[PDB]
Amino acid sequence: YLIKDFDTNGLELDRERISFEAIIKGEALHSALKDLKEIGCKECYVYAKTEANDENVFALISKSQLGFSKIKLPSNRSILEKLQVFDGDSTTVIDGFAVIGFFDFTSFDKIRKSTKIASKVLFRMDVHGVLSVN
Amino acid sequence: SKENLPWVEKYRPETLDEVYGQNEVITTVRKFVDEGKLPHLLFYGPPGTGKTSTIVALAREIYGKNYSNMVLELNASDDRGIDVVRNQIKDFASTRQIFSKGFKLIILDEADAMTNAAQNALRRVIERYTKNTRFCVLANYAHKLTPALLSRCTRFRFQPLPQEAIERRIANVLVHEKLKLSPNAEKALIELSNGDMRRVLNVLQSCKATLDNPDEDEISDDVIYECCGAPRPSDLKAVLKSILEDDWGTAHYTLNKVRSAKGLALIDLIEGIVKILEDYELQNEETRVHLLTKLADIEYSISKGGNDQIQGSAVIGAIKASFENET
Amino acid sequence: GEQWYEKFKPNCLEQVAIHKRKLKDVQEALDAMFLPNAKHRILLLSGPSGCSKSTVIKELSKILVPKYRQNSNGTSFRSTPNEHKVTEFRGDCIVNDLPQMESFSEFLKGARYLVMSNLSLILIEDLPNVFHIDTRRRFQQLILQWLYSSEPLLPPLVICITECEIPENDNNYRKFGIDYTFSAETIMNKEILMHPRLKRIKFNPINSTLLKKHLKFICVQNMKMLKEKNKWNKRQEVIDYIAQETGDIRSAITTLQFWATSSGSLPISTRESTISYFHAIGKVIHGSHSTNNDNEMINNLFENSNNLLSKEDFKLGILENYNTFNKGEFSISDASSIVDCLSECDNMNGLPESNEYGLREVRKTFRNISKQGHNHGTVYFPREWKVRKLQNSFKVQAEDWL
Amino acid sequence: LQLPWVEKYRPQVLSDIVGNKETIDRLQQIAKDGNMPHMIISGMPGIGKTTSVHCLAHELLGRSYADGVLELNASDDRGIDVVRNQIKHFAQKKLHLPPGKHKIVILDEADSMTAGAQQALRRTMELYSNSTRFAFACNQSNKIIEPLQSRCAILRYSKLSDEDVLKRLLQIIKLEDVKYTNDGLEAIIFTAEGDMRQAINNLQSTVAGHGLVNADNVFKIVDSPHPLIVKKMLLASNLEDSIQILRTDLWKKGYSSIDIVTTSFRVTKNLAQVKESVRLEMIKEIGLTHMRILEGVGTYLQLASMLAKIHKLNN
Amino acid sequence: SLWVDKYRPKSLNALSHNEELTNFLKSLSDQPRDLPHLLLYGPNGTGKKTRCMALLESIFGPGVYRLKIDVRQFVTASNRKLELNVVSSPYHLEITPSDMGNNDRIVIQELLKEVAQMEQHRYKCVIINEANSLTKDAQAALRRTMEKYSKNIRLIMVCDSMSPIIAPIKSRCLLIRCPAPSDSEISTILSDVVTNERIQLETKDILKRIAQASNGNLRVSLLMLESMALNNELALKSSSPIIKPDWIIVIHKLTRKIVKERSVNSLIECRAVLYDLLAHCIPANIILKELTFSLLDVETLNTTNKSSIIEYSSVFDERLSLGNKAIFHLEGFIAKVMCCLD
Amino acid sequence: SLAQQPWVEKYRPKNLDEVTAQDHAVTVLKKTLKSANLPHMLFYGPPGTGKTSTILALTKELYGPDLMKSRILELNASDERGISIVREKVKNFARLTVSKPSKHDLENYPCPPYKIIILDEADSMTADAQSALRRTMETYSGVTRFCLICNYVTRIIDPLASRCSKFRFKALDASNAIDRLRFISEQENVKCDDGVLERILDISAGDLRRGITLLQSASKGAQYLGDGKNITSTQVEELAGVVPHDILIEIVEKVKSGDFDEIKKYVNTFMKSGWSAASVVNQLHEYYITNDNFDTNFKNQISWLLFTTDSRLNNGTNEHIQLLNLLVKISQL
DNA sequence: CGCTCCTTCC
DNA sequence: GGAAGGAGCGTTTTTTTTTTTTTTT
């Protein structure tokens, strides 16, 4: 078919300013996405936070007919490996600032199948609010 | 390449600078974008006045190369039911910006074909998401639009293109592609266009195709009429004079000769005679009433298809009877 | 905080705003249905909004169920006497392991067991989603099975249907009977309505006398605030207005409370009542007393009753009943003009302004020849349906002969 | 990109709403007392129905507005399942609002809900009325089924008067320090036709496009209303004048024939200057022309013939 | 068996009236390879279907007269069942889409196209009864179906009036006029029938009356001849009364009532008779025509009354053609006629 | 197919070179043979003017037998053309990439970079379906071209008529299509008197299909007769269905002598012969208008009378009633 | 929206 | 025993396209 005038490359992540970046196991993320799908999630919240003494928090908060539910990943290296919350710069890491991204679950659930076969998942949020998943 | 495209698409304006005949609207939109105070837009107008072209050029100017992901365009050819409005448009208007390029534009082309439920659902979407989202509604028939949607959109009326704008665009087309157009041919083209640029471009393309060698041959009024098949003004004048002065047999012979020499259609002749009569001196209103009613009835009969000779004789008799009221 | 129409609810059968004749008829029918082997199995109550159908049903149940309910021998669920005189169906119940259309069935299959020692009056006021075609078919089939059932004992079944119009909505494009009117005829079918074991009693709007009496009682009950706010001396007029504005007791009480609570002076208004078919025909033919300008009346009727006036049934009724003006003794020219106008309207592809033209022509023609000394005939529903049925029979017979 | 003044200066308290002073005072008394009943607010678009309902809910609740208001709308799904689950659970929710307050369910644009949804609303209101109240907002009150109307107090909002529109426009101009004159404000009010949202939008467009507000500047952005031009065309003594109006003011300005015919019918419906028979004949001719246009002949000659027939009927 | 069918000619040579049409049919069947689509238009009862069957027999032999019937089911857009009794033969096919009302278009799209695609090398002949009753959409759909698949199928259509036929169809078909039989030919046919049936007759004039009471329709002529013969114990006398269709007598009585009583109550009473006639599935247009021409036969009325009657009849016939419900226009015609007469 | 097809189907133009009387548009269609610049086309005209044949020949010329089956999508009234079809099938075909031409077709045929969608009989499409075709016709104009064929141009919505270059197919008469009919007759060895072909064209009233069918019928009749005599005008008139001049004269005489009883009796007798009301109405119009023995006012009234009766007939009215009313009304005048 | 008839008040 | 108020009467026929909800899946 004729190539759509729309450029599919228009959506990309700016590497200069990354709000935060995370590494997670594929199995845990797939389980969390399945859990959100079961409860009929309508809106999703990606919450990321880094604090002192090696404190890492990555959570998915679902707004649905159940109300508000929370799924938080552990701090174990085997599941959640390594986290930064840069605050926008990709150079300096600060502690205490929480990055929150609000998404429609319709778009968020389109990566569950890709995550089922995943062996590793890299999450990245920029200041502009675009979520990148490798 | 673009040479393959029809002139109606090859000569599509790429920037607002190429848009002619909408100077007030163009300037208002320029000021809106320059001051960053563009409101919800409702471009209402007849076909081929430059609404889609104007909005596309505006989107190009605002964003540039990002027009792909900064603007969401929906038209009649696509599904625009209540479900589409509730999911696709809502998702597009409720998401952040790729590069903070001011706002996200939604071009609801041919929105007059949308369902009432879809418009009702879209009104509150328009109201809720306005900080970083904008709506443009293009229409040719306002009565199909709900009153609330009309009230919530700033209305811009696209008048029929003035003569000067069409002459400028014809000059640009001729300069772009080597071709000569006679002043009489240009005047006839303007008259038959009735403020439609699509007709202008189509007739120009077909008239170039009519000319044997489009290198040194100049377009003339005869070529324009032959290509379009419409009657020349002289034929209309002659047939009207015969009807209003000559006898029944002479009038019938004149009409038959006029419409058989070039195979003219009776609908075009009736329209031309109506236009000519609209600017005549009448001393009585009943004459005008008879002319208008009988001619409208005859056109309505012609629209459904019938006996051509019967309809022609009907036109002649209606004109003769109506003009008998005078004096 | 509590709304008055709920606070001032009847505590006995004598406080229900129901006419004596209708109340006696309902009592007799319900008592008959409670007999050991009752001929009637279903009580179909149909009427407008707020005519005290459910109220009178519950009040009568409170007196009847204790009389016939067989005494228990310690088999009651709880220590309480099981105060469940009325068992009602809830249309928004969503159990886990059950399809939606099967909800009502699951109710009915349970309702059969509420007999003898577990006697209870089965009331169906909150109907299932009858707008869904499959749900409506299942509901009709279940009702038919109940009527044709073969159990020695069944509990009395009462179906209260609030007859109201369905406003023309954009989300709905179908033009079925239920899409136009929500009544017993559209919800049920001919077989159920004509069943010998089903009794249908039609309720009427509450008359002005009962409304005035109950409004006066309500005002007397709340005397401190009315006297304090200086609205007592003018209460009567307000009540009168309500009495002549609506037949809905609930709406009347709500309007009275709204007027009383207002500290200033807000105009008194009540819910709008749809004009019936014969009422609309009479308005078109003989006119309206509440208005003298025909244009205003016709505009109001079209704006408020567009659904009824758009159908060809109204045009056929006008054609059928235009001759009852003076028992037919009026100039034939007027009849010819009316029929010619209706015929020419028939060619306008059912445009709304074609209906406007027809109704306005009829109104003008009847106003021209109107006089004080007029005696009218009887209004009859057009017999196009009978012609269609005869045509269908003719088609069947012709097919057989062929 | 500053927000448009239709939203930037949206009233937040009921005291800032101009027009319909009696109903607004009643709403203020309701907010003060707190005993809000089920209500239906009907009126013309853009007169302050949604704003009034939202302001009343805000004043009633305050810190509990988020947890005590369930705003549904046409853009949101409002089917029978929605009533069965979301509205039902919201009504069942037990709050701790002050003694004289109740949860508010704002069903904006309620005149578009499905029949089954309204039938379920009957039961949900019959059962959850002790702690939940419904504030329907619509344009036509009859679009709500009678069983639901029976439980709701009806408030009909009237068209805005010129004085209220002028007062609010002056307040907005003073807040924005916009330069204005008398003729410009008069033109804005005249073109508003009682719709304050339209008035604000036209004022903003005029100031942003031409700066100082003038009669000519306002007329540039906003044309004369179509219904008034149509009424002038219909009410004419000479057929020539009506034809001239139709050509210059309607046909040459880019108005479709179908729109002209529909507005002509609407105007003839509400015109009260001639006898019933004349208006009836005009409606008949308008209908014939509408028929002839719907089949494809949307030509100027058809409108001219319609005008000629109307003029003949008048004489 | 009914004498109408048991005497039906089964060959072109058997025809004894309208010899010009018989010769034209012979010419058409002379080279049955390039036969174009045919549209036979003529007054009802002339024998158009008989002529079509005779031509089909002369072309494809005698299997056409061996008719078979089948049930073909149709599913519409709304999943609605439709049943059309398909009359088929090993050499031809017959269909009456008018029985499907406004759904006839589907028959044009799903039946004719599918069979046309199938290849029989000779062609198949399809007959459409009451072509003028086809909706405009069906006629439009027929155009390219006929044009594209002329190799496989040749179409035969029959009608009593070409007015409701769209111009493209008339362009795509070869028109054949079928004049109705004259009084003499009907008299000869009836004489042969009575002679072969061993029925007694007194004078031939009776047959002429049988020809006059029908006035072109041979089917009703034979039916009423049989009715008279059986009623009179197989002895037709000169004074034997002529039996007419019941609805005809009803219409004449209604006309007499209209003439006698020009009043509103008279209109109301006539409305019931109109309802009964419509309930007998009598077409509204034929009702209007018969009422008009019964009224025009009244001796009391003068020229002006008759002219007004015919004007109103034509106007209301157009309104019936363009209208949905038929009662309005019939009642309006009657009311206007009564107003003028008064 | 040489002797097993109708003459109309066997003589369908195969190439644009043999289209007879559509030069005003055939020249434009030919000059774009090597232009790669074919625009969207709207052919409109009366029945049997050579619209489908023209587009089929154009497609054959540009693509050829092998490539035609892939670059052409044809839809007509017989096909179901609902709004959903327009949205899905037409859009999908328009958005498709043009199939790669082979070596042979490129060597021998232009093979333009665009395909064709032919919506024959577009006047039968609903307004909404026509609206759904507006932007599709424009978005994919670089790889697709549209052709809409119709008899009633007014039935096409204004936006589509604006989006398409309009070609009017003129009526074919004895001065435009005599050559084609003469060629067909010569190839079919059909014999006729001088002016017979002109009479057939005049009877056709601007429809070469009707003329060809009438010529085929006349040839069949002549062959069956087997007399070796040229076909005369009488035979073509009789097979065409034209009322004989004698019947017209008798009708005129009855009308002139105003008498309702006599007129209605004669009308009943005439209509019991199977004649068509349209033909007799046309003949009466010709006779009355062309006659110089009548006053101007009578012609003015009779023109409107004939127009009204013809309009009534086109609506599908009873021919008997309409003819009787027309005759009575002319008698009154 | 009237007719007709039945209840009730007075 | 007029006078007013009120009840009962007076009612049921399909079917083009398209969109949309509902339910099941």
Ligand SMILES: Nc1ncnc2c1ncn2[C@@H]1O[C@H](COP(=O)(O)OP(=O)(O)OP(O)(O)=S)[C@@H](O)[C@H]1O
């Ligand atoms: N102002 C203009 N200046 C130059 N060319 C124009 C102008 N308006 C229209 N055209 C030409 O005509 C074509 C019409 O394009 P559109 O902008 O879609 O017309 P339109 O006003 O949208 O008609 P509708 O309402 O969609 S049918 C353009 O692609 C140009 O080729």
Ligand SMILES: Nc1ncnc2c1ncn2[C@@H]1O[C@H](COP(=O)(O)OP(=O)(O)OP(O)(O)=S)[C@@H](O)[C@H]1O
């Ligand atoms: N005196 C009274 N008589 C009857 N109902 C009363 C009275 N006073 C208050 N009401 C209330 O008014 C309301 C109307 O009565 P309902 O019987 O519920 O109406 P309805 O006949 O059921 O109409 P629907 O279908 O419920 S809208 C009920 O909530 C009653 O409790």
Ligand SMILES: Nc1ncnc2c1ncn2[C@@H]1O[C@H](COP(=O)(O)OP(=O)(O)OP(O)(O)=S)[C@@H](O)[C@H]1O
């Ligand atoms: N009475 C009023 N006083 C002051 N501002 C008003 C008034 N009415 C409308 N406005 C302004 O117009 C804006 C839109 O008003 P809304 O109340 O949303 O319209 P509306 O009356 O609800 O019409 P609908 O129902 O949404 S179509 C408000 O945000 C105000 O800025």
Ligand SMILES: Nc1ncnc2c1ncn2[C@@H]1O[C@H](COP(=O)(O)OP(=O)(O)OP(O)(O)=S)[C@@H](O)[C@H]1O
């Ligand atoms: N210009 C022409 N030159 C030669 N033969 C023609 C011409 N026009 C029509 N014909 C003949 O008549 C037949 C008519 O075919 P079409 O081209 O489909 O007619 P048409 O213009 O499509 O009529 P409509 O509009 O579909 S009813 C052709 O197959 C030819 O046999």
Ligand SMILES: Nc1ncnc2c1ncn2[C@@H]1O[C@H](COP(=O)(O)OP(=O)(O)O)[C@@H](O)[C@H]1O
């Ligand atoms: N030429 C004929 N000779 C004898 N009988 C005929 C002839 N033509 C028709 N009929 C008779 O007329 C009857 C009805 O004819 P029919 O086929 O119904 O005509 P149409 O097709 O015009 O309605 C047939 O039963 C047939 O017996």
Ligand SMILES: [Mg+2]
């Ligand atoms: Mg556009």
Ligand SMILES: [Mg+2]
């Ligand atoms: Mg109740």
Ligand SMILES: [Mg+2]
């Ligand atoms: Mg609102």
Ligand SMILES: [Mg+2]
């Ligand atoms: Mg064709």
